[PDB]
Amino acid sequence: SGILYINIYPIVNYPETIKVSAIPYYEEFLPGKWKKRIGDLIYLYGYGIENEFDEIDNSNALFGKIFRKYLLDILSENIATPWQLKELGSTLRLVKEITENYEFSNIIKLQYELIINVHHWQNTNFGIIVDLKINILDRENNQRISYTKIKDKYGESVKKKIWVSVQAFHRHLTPEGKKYATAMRDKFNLLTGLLKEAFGSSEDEKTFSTPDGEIKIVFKPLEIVEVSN
Amino acid sequence: MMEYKIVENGLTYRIGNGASVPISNTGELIKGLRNYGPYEVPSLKYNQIALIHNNQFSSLINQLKSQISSKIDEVWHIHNINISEFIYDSPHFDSIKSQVDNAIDTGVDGIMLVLPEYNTPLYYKLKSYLINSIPSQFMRYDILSNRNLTFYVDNLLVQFVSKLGGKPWILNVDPEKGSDIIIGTGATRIDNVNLFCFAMVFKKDGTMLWNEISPIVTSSEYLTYLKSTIKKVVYGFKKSNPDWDVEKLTLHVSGKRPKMKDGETKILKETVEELKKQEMVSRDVKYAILHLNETHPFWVMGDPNNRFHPYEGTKVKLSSKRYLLTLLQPYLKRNGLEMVTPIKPLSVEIVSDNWTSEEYYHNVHEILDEIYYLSKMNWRGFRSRNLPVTVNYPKLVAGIIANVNRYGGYPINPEGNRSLQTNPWFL
RNA sequence: AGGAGGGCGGAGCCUAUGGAAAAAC
DNA sequence: GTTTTTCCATAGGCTCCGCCCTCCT
Ligand SMILES: [Mg+2]
């Protein structure tokens, strides 16, 4: 017996019903927030409603998808100052320049990347999937660069240092470049810390304002239980 | 919160003399191989393989040959073996081709080639020639120099013994357990174009082992060839072991999502209807189309004393149709567990099925345990790839064939040669 | 290419839902 | 008069290819 953690961050509170206004789809549709396309119907939610709303509960199958996009839209407006909105869509992308001490930071811009998505299961349980990536940017042109291109542009020592620093910022390896006995736990600690910092939360539980109510997230990994059958 | 269940313990490989060894412990497996040998020791026509290289009068090459002979004779029990030696002047394709021609003319069961360095066009243009003629095993001199000779030689010898027609080990698992037939899928994207390959794996001796492989198919011809593959694989299963009925047929898809209807599901359903029309499959035949995935955003943290990783065989229930499957695990050593990078699990989703709600739990757990079991049937080395064989092998075949086609190598047509379906040249 | 794993960069694939148009029959 | 293809669209999820390293009994 034991407990497993998944990196899905549970959402323990959300409105039971939301204001949804379904309108016929059109070719001039601009895909943005507060509106979604499901077939020939465009559903308006949150601030996008136009007072012909329809109350739909979580028992409906429409609720899961509309609420997925609802969470993606709501969390996009609670980004803290050090983090910036990269791309909003099926996933919420937040980036943040790594200002911690690493060598050749004046030529190689390493930044974090929180890829945020919603996991829904059991027809009523929602959650937030946070996946972390590191973007390596060549700081003079601010354009995306790879290890081979780093070695080409700056030499072997720069490439080795940046590789070690990236794998240490992922917490997969030690800062000196070796594997170690607590890399997975450090990776989860890193994910939780960056999620808390990105959404401006100094606490485990943060609440977010939405027209239909409030959303409460736990900012902790979701426990997995052993079932015997 | 989600639930999880671990594959039942007691898993062991099967050895030549009928004994068994604990899994995940390579040293005990090598000791057991010394004691009893491989499960199926190959029978060799010439009892003599060749060592082709260009580093003549090299102590590293001599140590490589000595280790090869010692492990082939002692731990692999291919007795009365002989390793010849051929030297090409230059690493160009013409000279190595001349030397492999000489080695074949002398009469050999396999070619053990040493490439000086890394060169993709030469390697594929020459491996296409080799697989069309004889079992082969490449080495890179730079990689061989920078690696411990024992581990390197043991892994290449696992690869070569499997390529020679041997069976190093099979899972000592229940034969009345799990599906009867599996048709895995693998893909390679070349210039934004998918080339697909099918692996036909089914129970021959009660044990499930890889049997056939398919040529690369275009996405346009993917569905028709999958239909033909289902019919051919069920026919081959019935040919292999009569007195048995086809009860479960699982299909593994990688590199593409299966279509939940009007796609792979439609083709498989129609094939099953036709097959039961000829009374080839059982009336109560249960099928499933599965999606296997590694680029999911999920990470699983486990027991702190297990390096914070889940034990191998852990099945995490994401939903009723999608599962996470832990296949690796930190390995014990003479001192303790070994430091490991965080390990990403395998996403297993049931896109389509025919199961009733009453049998769902049992059937899904059966297919998950069988995916875990065929994870351990990879024969490239002592540590098995996270992918199961059914999707690992076709991916390798598709990569090799596409690379040969793009690099101008000798065409590989598995349909022409029976050994092409029946021998792991791709390992 | 002895493998196993992770990371990064680059292209994109693929599913689902709808829509139309076209050729059938 | 009557089902297949073959293109669109948005919403979502991967997924292949390289190369960079740390490890193995
Ligand atoms: Mg190989």
mmCIF file of N, CA, C and O (backbone and C1' of nucleotides) in Angstrom, chain D residues 5-22:
data_model
loop_
_atom_site.group_PDB
_atom_site.id
_atom_site.type_symbol
_atom_site.label_atom_id
_atom_site.label_comp_id
_atom_site.label_asym_id
_atom_site.label_seq_id
_atom_site.Cartn_x
_atom_site.Cartn_y
_atom_site.Cartn_z
ATOM 1 P P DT D 5 -15.370 5.557 -50.308
ATOM 2 O "O5'" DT D 5 -14.516 6.780 -50.886
ATOM 3 C "C5'" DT D 5 -14.426 7.997 -50.155
ATOM 4 C "C4'" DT D 5 -14.154 9.163 -51.088
ATOM 5 C "C3'" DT D 5 -13.057 10.122 -50.626
ATOM 6 O "O3'" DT D 5 -12.293 10.549 -51.747
ATOM 7 C "C1'" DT D 5 -15.050 11.314 -50.954
ATOM 8 P P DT D 6 -10.888 11.303 -51.544
ATOM 9 O "O5'" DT D 6 -11.029 12.610 -52.456
ATOM 10 C "C5'" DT D 6 -12.279 13.287 -52.534
ATOM 11 C "C4'" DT D 6 -12.134 14.738 -52.116
ATOM 12 C "C3'" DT D 6 -10.966 15.020 -51.171
ATOM 13 O "O3'" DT D 6 -10.331 16.237 -51.533
ATOM 14 C "C1'" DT D 6 -12.972 15.755 -50.189
ATOM 15 P P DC D 7 -8.745 16.406 -51.346
ATOM 16 O "O5'" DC D 7 -8.576 17.925 -50.879
ATOM 17 C "C5'" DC D 7 -9.025 18.321 -49.591
ATOM 18 C "C4'" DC D 7 -10.114 19.370 -49.699
ATOM 19 C "C3'" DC D 7 -10.075 20.431 -48.620
ATOM 20 O "O3'" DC D 7 -9.194 21.470 -49.012
ATOM 21 C "C1'" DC D 7 -12.307 19.637 -48.921
ATOM 22 P P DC D 8 -8.417 22.333 -47.903
ATOM 23 O "O5'" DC D 8 -9.518 23.370 -47.397
ATOM 24 C "C5'" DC D 8 -9.887 23.388 -46.036
ATOM 25 C "C4'" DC D 8 -11.164 24.176 -45.831
ATOM 26 C "C3'" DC D 8 -11.363 24.683 -44.415
ATOM 27 O "O3'" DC D 8 -10.823 25.988 -44.299
ATOM 28 C "C1'" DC D 8 -13.271 23.455 -45.081
ATOM 29 P P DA D 9 -9.759 26.319 -43.142
ATOM 30 O "O5'" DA D 9 -10.666 26.544 -41.851
ATOM 31 C "C5'" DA D 9 -11.788 27.408 -41.917
ATOM 32 C "C4'" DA D 9 -12.759 27.108 -40.795
ATOM 33 C "C3'" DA D 9 -12.116 26.862 -39.447
ATOM 34 O "O3'" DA D 9 -11.890 28.100 -38.792
ATOM 35 C "C1'" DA D 9 -13.818 25.242 -39.876
ATOM 36 P P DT D 10 -10.708 28.248 -37.714
ATOM 37 O "O5'" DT D 10 -11.376 27.769 -36.344
ATOM 38 C "C5'" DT D 10 -12.623 28.307 -35.936
ATOM 39 C "C4'" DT D 10 -13.288 27.405 -34.916
ATOM 40 C "C3'" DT D 10 -12.555 27.292 -33.580
ATOM 41 O "O3'" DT D 10 -13.491 27.264 -32.515
ATOM 42 C "C1'" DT D 10 -12.839 25.158 -34.493
ATOM 43 P P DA D 11 -12.979 27.313 -30.993
ATOM 44 O "O5'" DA D 11 -12.763 25.779 -30.604
ATOM 45 C "C5'" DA D 11 -13.672 25.144 -29.728
ATOM 46 C "C4'" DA D 11 -13.100 23.838 -29.211
ATOM 47 C "C3'" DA D 11 -11.878 23.977 -28.297
ATOM 48 O "O3'" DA D 11 -12.105 23.282 -27.079
ATOM 49 C "C1'" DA D 11 -11.476 22.380 -30.004
ATOM 50 P P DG D 12 -10.986 23.275 -25.928
ATOM 51 O "O5'" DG D 12 -10.128 21.964 -26.243
ATOM 52 C "C5'" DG D 12 -10.778 20.710 -26.348
ATOM 53 C "C4'" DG D 12 -9.805 19.623 -26.756
ATOM 54 C "C3'" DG D 12 -8.494 19.583 -25.965
ATOM 55 O "O3'" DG D 12 -8.461 18.415 -25.158
ATOM 56 C "C1'" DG D 12 -8.170 19.208 -28.301
ATOM 57 P P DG D 13 -7.189 18.101 -24.231
ATOM 58 O "O5'" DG D 13 -6.258 17.200 -25.158
ATOM 59 C "C5'" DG D 13 -6.777 16.025 -25.757
ATOM 60 C "C4'" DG D 13 -5.677 15.270 -26.471
ATOM 61 C "C3'" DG D 13 -4.322 15.301 -25.760
ATOM 62 O "O3'" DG D 13 -3.770 13.999 -25.696
ATOM 63 C "C1'" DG D 13 -4.077 15.944 -28.006
ATOM 64 P P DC D 14 -2.675 13.648 -24.575
ATOM 65 O "O5'" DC D 14 -1.347 14.368 -25.097
ATOM 66 C "C5'" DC D 14 -0.376 13.637 -25.836
ATOM 67 C "C4'" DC D 14 -0.904 13.248 -27.201
ATOM 68 C "C3'" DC D 14 0.086 12.494 -28.074
ATOM 69 O "O3'" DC D 14 -0.614 11.588 -28.913
ATOM 70 C "C1'" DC D 14 -0.474 14.508 -29.121
ATOM 71 P P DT D 15 0.181 10.513 -29.802
ATOM 72 O "O5'" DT D 15 0.833 11.389 -30.965
ATOM 73 C "C5'" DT D 15 1.149 10.797 -32.200
ATOM 74 C "C4'" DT D 15 2.562 11.145 -32.620
ATOM 75 C "C3'" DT D 15 3.676 10.571 -31.735
ATOM 76 O "O3'" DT D 15 4.665 9.994 -32.563
ATOM 77 C "C1'" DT D 15 4.021 12.855 -32.088
ATOM 78 P P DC D 16 5.755 8.972 -31.976
ATOM 79 O "O5'" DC D 16 6.735 8.759 -33.213
ATOM 80 C "C5'" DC D 16 6.209 8.767 -34.531
ATOM 81 C "C4'" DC D 16 6.863 9.844 -35.375
ATOM 82 C "C3'" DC D 16 8.353 10.002 -35.175
ATOM 83 O "O3'" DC D 16 9.060 9.026 -35.919
ATOM 84 C "C1'" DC D 16 7.316 12.133 -35.269
ATOM 85 P P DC D 17 10.527 8.577 -35.446
ATOM 86 O "O5'" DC D 17 11.455 9.790 -35.896
ATOM 87 C "C5'" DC D 17 11.495 10.185 -37.259
ATOM 88 C "C4'" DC D 17 12.319 11.445 -37.421
ATOM 89 C "C3'" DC D 17 13.631 11.437 -36.667
ATOM 90 O "O3'" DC D 17 14.628 10.804 -37.448
ATOM 91 C "C1'" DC D 17 12.499 13.489 -36.294
ATOM 92 P P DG D 18 16.110 10.613 -36.866
ATOM 93 O "O5'" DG D 18 16.878 11.917 -37.372
ATOM 94 C "C5'" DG D 18 18.101 12.293 -36.770
ATOM 95 C "C4'" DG D 18 18.062 13.745 -36.339
ATOM 96 C "C3'" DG D 18 19.071 14.114 -35.277
ATOM 97 O "O3'" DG D 18 20.301 14.456 -35.892
ATOM 98 C "C1'" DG D 18 16.925 15.058 -34.783
ATOM 99 P P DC D 19 21.656 13.708 -35.467
ATOM 100 O "O5'" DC D 19 22.153 14.525 -34.192
ATOM 101 C "C5'" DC D 19 22.106 15.943 -34.201
ATOM 102 C "C4'" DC D 19 21.982 16.474 -32.789
ATOM 103 C "C3'" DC D 19 23.016 15.913 -31.809
ATOM 104 O "O3'" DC D 19 23.844 16.952 -31.322
ATOM 105 C "C1'" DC D 19 20.810 15.891 -30.884
ATOM 106 P P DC D 20 25.212 16.601 -30.558
ATOM 107 O "O5'" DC D 20 24.860 16.843 -29.020
ATOM 108 C "C5'" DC D 20 24.296 18.079 -28.611
ATOM 109 C "C4'" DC D 20 23.888 18.025 -27.152
ATOM 110 C "C3'" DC D 20 24.630 16.997 -26.330
ATOM 111 O "O3'" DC D 20 25.858 17.539 -25.888
ATOM 112 C "C1'" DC D 20 22.296 16.959 -25.822
ATOM 113 P P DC D 21 26.915 16.608 -25.123
ATOM 114 O "O5'" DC D 21 26.538 16.795 -23.585
ATOM 115 C "C5'" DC D 21 26.916 15.810 -22.645
ATOM 116 C "C4'" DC D 21 25.730 15.394 -21.802
ATOM 117 C "C3'" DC D 21 25.980 14.202 -20.901
ATOM 118 O "O3'" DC D 21 26.499 14.639 -19.658
ATOM 119 C "C1'" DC D 21 23.781 14.174 -21.907
ATOM 120 P P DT D 22 27.362 13.636 -18.750
ATOM 121 O "O5'" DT D 22 26.260 12.743 -18.023
ATOM 122 C "C5'" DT D 22 25.308 13.354 -17.174
ATOM 123 C "C4'" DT D 22 24.503 12.310 -16.424
ATOM 124 C "C3'" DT D 22 25.326 11.211 -15.758
ATOM 125 O "O3'" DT D 22 24.735 10.854 -14.518
ATOM 126 C "C1'" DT D 22 23.874 10.254 -17.366
#
